[PDB]
Every structure is written in C-alpha cells, then in structure tokens.
Amino acid sequence: DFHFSAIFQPTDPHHHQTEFAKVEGSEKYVEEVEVFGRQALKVNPEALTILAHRAFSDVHHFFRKDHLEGWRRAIEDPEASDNDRYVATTLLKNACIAAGRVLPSCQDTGTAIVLGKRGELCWTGGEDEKYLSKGIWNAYRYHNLRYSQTAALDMFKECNTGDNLPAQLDLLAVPGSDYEFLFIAKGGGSANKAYLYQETKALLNPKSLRAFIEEKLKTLGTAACPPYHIALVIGGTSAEMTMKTVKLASCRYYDSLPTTGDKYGRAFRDPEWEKIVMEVAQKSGIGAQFGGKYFAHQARVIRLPRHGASCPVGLAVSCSADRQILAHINKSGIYIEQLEQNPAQYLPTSVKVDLKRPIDKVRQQLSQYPVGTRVMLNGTLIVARDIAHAKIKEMMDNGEPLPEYMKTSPIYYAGPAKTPEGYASGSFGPTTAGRMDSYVDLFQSHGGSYITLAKGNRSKQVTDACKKHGGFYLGSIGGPAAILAKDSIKQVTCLAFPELGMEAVWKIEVEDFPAFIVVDDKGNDMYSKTLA
Amino acid sequence: NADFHFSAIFQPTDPHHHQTEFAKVEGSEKYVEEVEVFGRQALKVNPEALTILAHRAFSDVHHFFRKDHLEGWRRAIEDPEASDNDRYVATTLLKNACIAAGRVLPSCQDTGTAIVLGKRGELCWTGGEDEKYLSKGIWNAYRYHNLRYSQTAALDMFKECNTGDNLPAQLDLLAVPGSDYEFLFIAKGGGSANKAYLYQETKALLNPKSLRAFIEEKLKTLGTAACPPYHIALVIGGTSAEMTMKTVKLASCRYYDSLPTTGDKYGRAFRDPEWEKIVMEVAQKSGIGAQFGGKYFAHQARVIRLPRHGASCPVGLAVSCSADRQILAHINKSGIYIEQLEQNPAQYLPDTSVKVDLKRPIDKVRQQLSQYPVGTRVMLNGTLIVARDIAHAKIKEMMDNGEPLPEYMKTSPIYYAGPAKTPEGYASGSFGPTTAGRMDSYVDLFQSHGGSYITLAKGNRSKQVTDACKKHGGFYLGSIGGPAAILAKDSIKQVTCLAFPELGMEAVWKIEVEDFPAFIVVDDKGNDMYSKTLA
Numbered sequence A: 001d002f003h004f005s006a007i008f009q010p011t012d013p014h015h016h017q018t019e020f021a022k023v024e025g026s027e028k029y030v031e032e033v034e035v036f037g038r039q040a041l042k043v044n045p046e047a048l049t050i051l052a053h054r055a056f057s058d059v060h061h062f063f064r065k066d067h068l069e070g071w072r073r074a075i076e077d078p079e080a081s082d083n084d085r086y087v088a089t090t091l092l093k094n095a096c097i098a099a100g101r102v103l104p105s106c107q108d109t110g111t112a113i114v115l116g117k118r119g120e121l122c123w124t125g126g127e128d129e130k131y132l133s134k135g136i137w138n139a140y141r142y143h144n145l146r147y148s149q150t151a152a153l154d155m156f157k158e159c160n161t162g163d164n165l166p167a168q169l170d171l172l173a174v175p176g177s178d179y180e181f182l183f184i185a186k187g188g189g190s191a192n193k194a195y196l197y198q199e200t201k202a203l204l205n206p207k208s209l210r211a212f213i214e215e216k217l218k219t220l221g222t223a224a225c226p227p228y229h230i231a232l233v234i235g236g237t238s239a240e241m242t243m244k245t246v247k248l249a250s251c252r253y254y255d256s257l258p259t260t261g262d263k264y265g266r267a268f269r270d271p272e273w274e275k276i277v278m279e280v281a282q283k284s285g286i287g288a289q290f291g292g293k294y295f296a297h298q299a300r301v302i303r304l305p306r307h308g309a310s311c312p313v314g315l316a317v318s319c320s321a322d323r324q325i326l327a328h329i330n331k332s333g334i335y336i337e338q339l340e341q342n343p344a345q346y347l348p349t350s351v352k353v354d355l356k357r358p359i360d361k362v363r364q365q366l367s368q369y370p371v372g373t374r375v376m377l378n379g380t381l382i383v384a385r386d387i388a389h390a391k392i393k394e395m396m397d398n399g400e401p402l403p404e405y406m407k408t409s410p411i412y413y414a415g416p417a418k419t420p421e422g423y424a425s426g427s428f429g430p431t432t433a434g435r436m437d438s439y440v441d442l443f444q445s446h447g448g449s450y451i452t453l454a455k456g457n458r459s460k461q462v463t464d465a466c467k468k469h470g471g472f473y474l475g476s477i478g479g480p481a482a483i484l485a486k487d488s489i490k491q492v493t494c495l496a497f498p499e500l501g502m503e504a505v506w507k508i509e510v511e512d513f514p515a516f517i518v519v520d521d522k523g524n525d526m527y528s529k530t531l532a
Numbered sequence B: 001n002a003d004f005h006f007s008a009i010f011q012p013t014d015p016h017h018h019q020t021e022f023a024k025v026e027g028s029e030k031y032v033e034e035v036e037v038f039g040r041q042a043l044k045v046n047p048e049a050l051t052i053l054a055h056r057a058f059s060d061v062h063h064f065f066r067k068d069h070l071e072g073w074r075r076a077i078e079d080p081e082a083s084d085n086d087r088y089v090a091t092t093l094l095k096n097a098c099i100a101a102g103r104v105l106p107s108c109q110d111t112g113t114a115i116v117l118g119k120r121g122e123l124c125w126t127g128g129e130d131e132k133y134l135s136k137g138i139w140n141a142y143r144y145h146n147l148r149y150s151q152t153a154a155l156d157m158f159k160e161c162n163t164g165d166n167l168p169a170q171l172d173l174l175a176v177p178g179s180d181y182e183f184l185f186i187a188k189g190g191g192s193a194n195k196a197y198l199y200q201e202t203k204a205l206l207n208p209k210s211l212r213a214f215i216e217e218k219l220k221t222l223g224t225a226a227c228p229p230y231h232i233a234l235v236i237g238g239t240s241a242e243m244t245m246k247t248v249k250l251a252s253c254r255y256y257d258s259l260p261t262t263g264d265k266y267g268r269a270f271r272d273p274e275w276e277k278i279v280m281e282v283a284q285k286s287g288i289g290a291q292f293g294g295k296y297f298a299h300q301a302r303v304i305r306l307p308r309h310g311a312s313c314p315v316g317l318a319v320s321c322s323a324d325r326q327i328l329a330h331i332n333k334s335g336i337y338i339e340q341l342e343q344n345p346a347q348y349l350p351d352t353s354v355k356v357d358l359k360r361p362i363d364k365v366r367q368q369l370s371q372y373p374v375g376t377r378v379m380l381n382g383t384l385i386v387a388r389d390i391a392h393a394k395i396k397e398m399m400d401n402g403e404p405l406p407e408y409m410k411t412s413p414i415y416y417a418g419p420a421k422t423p424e425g426y427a428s429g430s431f432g433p434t435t436a437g438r439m440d441s442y443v444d445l446f447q448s449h450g451g452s453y454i455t456l457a458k459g460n461r462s463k464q465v466t467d468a469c470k471k472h473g474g475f476y477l478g479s480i481g482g483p484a485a486i487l488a489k490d491s492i493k494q495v496t497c498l499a500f501p502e503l504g505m506e507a508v509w510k511i512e513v514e515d516f517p518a519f520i521v522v523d524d525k526g527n528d529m530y531s532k533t534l535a
C-alpha cells in the first residue's frame, strides 16, 4: 500500500529551539485574513526588504553561541596546542571588534543567500525576489561591507557588479500561511570547500568509510579559516540535492532530524559517525590553522536514500565567518534570530620583521628562521589577488615586465571591504593563498613575489619555487579582518586597476601584523606533516 | 534607492516553454476553478490533479523521446563521418525506442529516480499537500506499469533495503508569481546521475587556452559509463556548488535553451553557443564515439556561464544519457497540459560478428575468446549469471568470513544487470547492462578464487581490471548500453531467480540469452579497447 514519507522529517521544523526578536512595529506589514474557509496572511512586500536588510546587517557583526563556545573550548582545553589557543583568542577578539557594528567580522562579506519557504496562503504580491534583493542591496550599499560578485560580460570578460548582487534566492512553496527564512552570508573561500564525490556501494562499510573520511578531511586543509563546522552527507537523490543538504547541514539547519532510518528511506543524522568525524579531525593534528587539536568545532553527518546504482557524497564546512540567521514572518510581524551581542563573555614570543628595507634584506632575515616561526611585520605591503595576478601574467606573456610594485615589498593576497568614515581601513584580512599558486614560480623567475602573505596551505609547486628562488610564504591568521584593520593597517592607497574594486592592486602600510613562516627558502612546509 | 536595479539570474525568453508542444488531459478542466480574492485572480486546484499529472508523466516518459534526442541518433546513422560502430549503436538505440513505443517495455531497465521540479504560483491553491499527491502519482506509475523499484533506503549507515516502490522522489517545489503550476518531470537514471561532476576552479581557468584544455581533460573522464551519445551540459560559475549543480542538471534537460546569449553588468546567466561548439568539437575529435569508438560521443552541448563570487569558480559537468527522460507540464485555468513526445520513433530509421556458445565449459569459452583482439563484436548464446552491486558486496563479505566463492559465480559469464518488472506473458522485462566500473574492486578477488573470468556489462573499466584479466586469463565484454527493451524482447528467453531474492532487482539471476551482442573490451593479454581514446 502507498505510504508517503517525506525525506526530511525534523522534529523542530519551525526552529523553535532558536531565539527570535520581533522587529518593532513590523505588525503593520502583515494582516491575517480568512479566505474560502482557510486562514491566510497578507504580507506587504516591503517586509521582505526590511527583513533582508536587517539580516545581512546583523550577521556581519555577531555570531551564534555554538560558534563562540567552540572558540572558548579551544582556549580552555589543556590538550589544545599553543597555536590553537592563539588563533582562537585572535578570532574571539576579532568578534568583539565586529560587535561594535562598524567593521564586519570578515572582509569577505560573502554571497547573499536566501532560503525562503512561502506558505500556500502567504500572499506577498509575488515580487519576492526584487524586494529581497533591495534589502540585500541596502545592507551592502549603506554599511561597510564589500561588493564581491563578478559578472561575466562574455565567457572571459568580467566586471564587478558594484553592489554585491545577484543574490542566490531559493524560494520554496510549502504548506500554511507563514514565510520562513534562512539567510546565509557565505564566504567565497568556505564556499570553495564544498566538495562532491561520486562513490559506490563499495564505500558503505565501516572500514572503507572511515578511511574515506580521513582522506577527504585533509583536502579541506586550512584554506577556509578553521575551526570548521564540518558537514558530511552520504547519499542523496541527485548531486545537487546532496550538495544542498550538506550546505544546510553545515548551517545546523537539520539538527532536529531523526537519528535512525526506516524502510521508507527518511534522512537521519548519525551521531556515531559525527563522533568519528570529530575524532578524525582532532587526531589529524591540523588544528586551528597552525597545528593542534581544533581543526573542527563540531560535525554534522546526514545519511540520505540513494538510487541503487548511485552514491553521491557531499563534504562542506562553515568557516570562522560562520554567518547564518533564521527568520520568519507571521501574523505578529517580522522575527529575526537573536545572535550573541556580547562575545566578550567567551574570552577567559615573535620575531619583529622590518619591511622598510630592501626586499633582499627582508629575505635574508627570514632565511634565519624555520617554518612555524611567528613573525610580526612592520612596513609596506603590496596587495594583489586573483584578477590582478591574471592581468600581470598576461602582461608578461605579451613581453611587458613584471611591474615594479610586485618586486619591492611582500605581496599580501587580500581584497578590502569598504572603509568606514574616519577609519584608516575597512576589514582587510587575507585571501586564500592556494588560488595564486600557479603564478609563484613564474613571478619569482622574473624577479618578484619572493615573499607572499596570505592564509591556507599551498601546493608543492610553491614549496619548490621558494626553494629554487629563495622565497617565502607567510601565513596570516585567517578570519580576523576587523582587528587587523583596527590595529594593524594604518594607510591604504589604490595602486593599479581601480576598475577591479576590491580586487585592485593596493599599497598599504602596516604595523604589528602577525604571521607564521609556512614555506621557507629551503624546501620546508609547515603543513607537510599534517596535510601529507 | 535610485541606483538599485534588480536582475534575475535566469531570464529565459520562453519562460513558459511555448516552443514545446503540449497535449491537454481530456476533461481535466474539472480539477481547477478560477476565483478572485482581494482583487486578484487565483486558481483552486484539486490536488488529485497532481496525482493524475505525475502518473501520466512517469508513464509517457519511459516509452517515448523528444525529437531532438531522436534526431541525434539519425544524425549518427546518416553522417559519413560517423564510424561503423557509431551507426550500429545508434541503429540499436533507435530500434530499442521503437519497442519502447509499444507502451509495454520501458526504454531502459533503469527506470530512474523520480524528480519533480514544480513552480507553484503565489495564487495557485492546491490545499498544500503537493508532495503527497505527487508521490502518489509517481507511486502509481511505478507500481502499475512494468518499471523498476530502484531506491535504496538506509536503515542505518550501512544496513540497506529496497523501498519496494521507487519512492522517495526528489520534489523541488518553488514559489513563483502568478496562479499556475508549472512542472519539469525527470526520470533520471543512476548511471547518468553519477556522471554529474563538480569542480572547484579559479580565475586561472578563465582564459581560452586553459578552458579548452580543461574541457578536453574532463570530457574523457565521463567515459562511456552513462550510455552515450550524451547531451553534454557544462556550467561555468554559480553562486554556490548546489546552484551550479542544479543548473547543469537543468541545462542537460534543455530547460535553459531560451536564455540570452550575452552577459551584462548585472551578472545574468547566458548560454554560450561559441563554447557549445567547442564542446562538440572536443567530443567529436576525442574519438570516444557512441560507446565503441567514433564521432558521436555527444548529441549536442549546452554551456551556461554564471556569475561568481570573486574568490570562487564552481564548474559543473553533467550528461543526459540514452534514456533521455524529461517532460514539461503545466496546470492552468484550462486544465492539465503535458508535453507531447514523439510517438512514432520509427520514422527516424533510414531505409561481422563471432558466435559464442556459452553452453560450454567456461574454460572453452575463454579459449575461444582468446583467439580474438579487443574490439571484436561477438554474439552470445546461452546462460548468464546476473549480479551487481549488492550481490557482489554480499559475496565478498562471505569470503571475508572464510566462505568460498559460490559455485554459481564460476559456471557462466557474470552479467551485471538489474531487471525491470516482467510484463504479463513476457519472458523478461527490460534488462540492459549495469555500469561495469562499479564492480571493478571485485574482479581480481573473484578471479583469484576461480570465478568471474568473463564479465558482461557496459562502460570503460579501471586498470586493475585489465591487469586482472591478463593475470587470470579473463575477459570483459561490453554490451551496448541503453537498449534494454530490445534485449528483453529479442535476446532474453528465460529468467529465474537464483539467490538473494530479498534484493529485488539486485538479486542473483540465472538467464538464458540468444543473439546477445557485445564487444570484447578487455582481453586476457593486457589490451583494452578504450586505452587510446580514454588515456
């Protein structure tokens, strides 16, 4: 006999476990009505603008408790490494600055993502996408965020949209008369660490699955600013469904799923394998970016049904800029998840490197120290990331020289957020180093980029280049964009390619900028043991 | 507020698919009623319409194809640049479609995962139980027709059982403007679903030389495991991995065919016909062909360029296979409308092999096969033992526990397959091959224990299988992938369940076949038919 079984059966489908605050006066935007014997809700679409604007404002300055608790755990655990505690303390101090509501917690203010669930009898006028986009537009235009979206004019010619649009707007049709939301400000680097694997029944045994988990976690590396919220999804009805599920799992959206399966194929959370993921993450030694125990805050594992011939697997993380906010509109008005507004309640040597010298003198100083040495940089940095590197490679391919500004100073891979009025800099933390790996040997062979400064582990070609050319890769702490801007960056100037927006080449003057020597000029790599 | 400009990512010029031919379900206007509430037009829809619609969609789609799919098979037959094997495979698939058009046998034994993309208007009122009513219609189609129950439930992380009804479905129901209900139904095979790939790339990819080299490298990794000729879809960019993968799926269904062909400063999606031509050139010059060498690796290509976060460049690659099964539909004030597929595929048909007797000692069959090079076409006559993913896993588990390889794995060639349900009065339901590569990890082990010397399935296999067959005097025979109905109708003469009946279509079967075509893909000498094109 026919029995309908929804794949996802949360015990808390409306997220009653979350605390919400009502937007004052927002009941003027809604009206409960009764039509053809059923209860319905008229929603002024301006409510969607108001809600999206506040969601994408609040989320850049505050965090959830389970995120902040993880940083406290890394500081207080006796088994945490010194580097575990240093990174966690830095990230918590960064959250305190961001809670001042001026600087966003990260320079990568992310892609704006909206999961919306509009009830059958929730009536907005139907222009939901436009009104939500206006609210997102408002948040990024009138606050000190960043325009990160890149439009394709043709296959290869690109320009910044200049407003952080388009958003990802996933609006679902559901029962009832309410409007429920999950807003995500998703960083590009953590988005890049969403992986899809096409596996088989041969994986579905304890030995093979455990070895698989050990192998894939290492490929996450430190490139998305751990401690991670790690999500793993085994199975699914399609690749895109698997990847949607792992995204939502990483946002703890599916925390109230059942923990057992049944003959109808319902999804379930697997706490036993969540513990195994956490054990793998801790035993890996990767740590909170620079070696140790706190590779991961927590883990989510969801098992899904599958076609007999198929076994898609999804792996994804939420990064240090863990940014999601639940919301709903009902007959009483607009409700938005309440985040932690006082992160300070969770708070319980190094080599000085003078950059105001010839670069060869800086290289000589750095050559005296092994990888893992903590350094403090003082002086000028030249800032360049993906598009600038690509344009410079193209210039050299056309016979033009490597520009002088790539040869005078360490290269900081970064793209700043907008500068608050009266501030020297907006949030200005590092870009993932690995995306520039294909340029290092070329630029060094042409006399520049001997010293780079960014975050994340890099490929072997960069280790080989630095040894061949006498170069160095310095790893900044990943994530603390606001405290770096507040305490370290003293002057910012646009140097080249101003049309690239945040991806322009910048010249900045810094003081007390912390980093680790990750790759030296001798073939050594701080990550060679943990990420082998 | 003056500089704000809203731009939807997807701006099709034909959003309601007026270019598609639809048929009205007779009398279906009785399921809808136009009303007016708060000055706005709304449509009340009896949810039983959703059951009727889903039932007909997942019945029609298993027996008929779109014109653009059938035209590709005709092109492979009529093109002078097509190889002999290209024409042979395309002719076989067209003949298979003529059988499937009889509405008894489905076109493929893998009747797929049921996928529904639904777009419910703000003022389209169904009562809200859409997922249940759609699932009941899907349940009806798979229960009362000669399809297959393919969905595997997880009782725990590792303990599995077949759901016995091909549920659950993938139901993606979206909230959109208006008062109509629009649908795309997909019956998605597992093998083509497995060839949906996500790559996390960078700006370093986004130049003509790098992108062309990337396409050349990735298209080969598709191999022949999803029964080409493919509809190849490639998506460059996206706002998230899941959005990229959703887009590449819909692109492969030609859902986005009416997108613009140029970008703008607002980041709208666009189809790129120039790079679609490049994808087709790469696929043709690859020499992979329609499964067995030639030009027709691909029917056609779709390339969609998407906006991206500056730090990101997700890329999606996916195919629609020979069982190219999607059907558009909509409900409006006039009733239920369903896309009209081609009911006379025979009009696309236009106006050498070694006979292998399997009713011999297996060692004599091996001795005969050893006389021929890879690429030789054979015709099999006799008994096959049928086993795929779960049966192989269960047998390896038995052996790991000290038990012998069962005798029934040593007496006959092993056919990887899982049959659809048998029509009344028929010897067999649709019964084409499973992807060989998924069983690769068992071949050397089983051959070391005196069985699985000869396997029969579809797709290229990994090097460990070539090494095993050379070490153990084995062979891998490649069936044509896709023609499950003509194989059932013409070649499969008897089917009996031998072991593991609780596995449903994944049980071990003993079947008797006649005139079953295949190619020698791997021989007993280290040779592989795909070693040049898929290197």
Ligand code: F3S
Binding pocket: A106, A107, A108, A110, A186, A187, A188, A189, A190, A223, A224, A225, A319, A320, A321, A429, A430, A478, A479
């Ligand atoms: S968005 Fe996340 S990956 Fe790092 S650069 Fe910002 S914390």
Ligand code: F3S
Binding pocket: B108, B109, B110, B112, B188, B189, B190, B191, B192, B225, B226, B227, B321, B322, B323, B432, B433, B481, B482
């Ligand atoms: S569903 Fe498609 S991949 Fe082959 S086995 Fe059937 S034609």
Ligand SMILES: [Fe+3]
Binding pocket: A188, A189, A192, A223, A432, A435, B311
């Ligand atoms: Fe990255």
Ligand SMILES: [Fe+3]
Binding pocket: A309, B190, B191, B194, B225, B435, B438
């Ligand atoms: Fe497969």
